[PDB]
């Protein structure tokens, strides 16, 4: 069992990788300079104040 996730940063050109997990995640937060979006595998535990979106479909984190 495998899956295709996205992993690019923010508004960079899209890239993909092979997740061995059953979810792909998008992680959004905002520091003083602007908004950061991190994409990857699984469903990580995030610190408070961070938007998280986990999804169980191919190419689902964008």
């Amino acid at each position: 069992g495998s899956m295709i996730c996205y992993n690019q940063q923010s508004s960079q050109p899209p890239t993909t990788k092979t997740c061995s997990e059953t979810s792909c995640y998008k992680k959004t937060w905002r520091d003083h300079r602007g908004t950061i979006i991190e994409r990857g595998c699984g469903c990580p535990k995030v610190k408070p104040g961070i938007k998280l979106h986990c999804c169980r479909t191919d190419k689902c984190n964008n």
Binding site: W29, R30, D31, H32, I36, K47, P48, G49, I50
Partner: protein, 198 residues
Amino acid sequence: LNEEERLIRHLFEEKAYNKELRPAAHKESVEISLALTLSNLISLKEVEETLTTNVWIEQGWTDSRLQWDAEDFGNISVLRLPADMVWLPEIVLENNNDGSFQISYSCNVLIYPSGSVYWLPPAIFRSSCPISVTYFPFDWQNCSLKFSSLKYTTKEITLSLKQAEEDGRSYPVEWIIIDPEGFTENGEWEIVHRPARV
């Protein structure tokens, strides 16, 4: 170096920039936009009644002398200058209790072709936070960081909050910015509210 040095020589030697003069007419006020980022909360000493903070203060203002058209300088769109070369509003913490009014590290300013000046000095500040001991050790405290200019009055500068944008709509940043990913909570103090006011 060529366009950078050319632009510096155009702005500061050819135009004869004077850092002692405000970037405004004599009867006009300069709009300073302020935001605060709390890097980390060091301590609140109860006996000494002192809040210690690491804060990055973001100052923005338009200087109409420090502007250029990018097409005459090789499409250069940003310049980094020492803070000692430009006019500064000289924003200080009036609430300090140790005499350290000023920011800690006087970093470079960033100037842009529009004449906008961006400055993000970091600072370590010791301020007076009066302590309410009534419900100790189940107490909560209300500390403040009061920023103003002792060199200029309301006629000379006008303080305001930073205006950020979301989906093309502007809003004033009415809170202390804390980076959620990089913030480490203080060992004994949790933060409940972070408002900001003019």
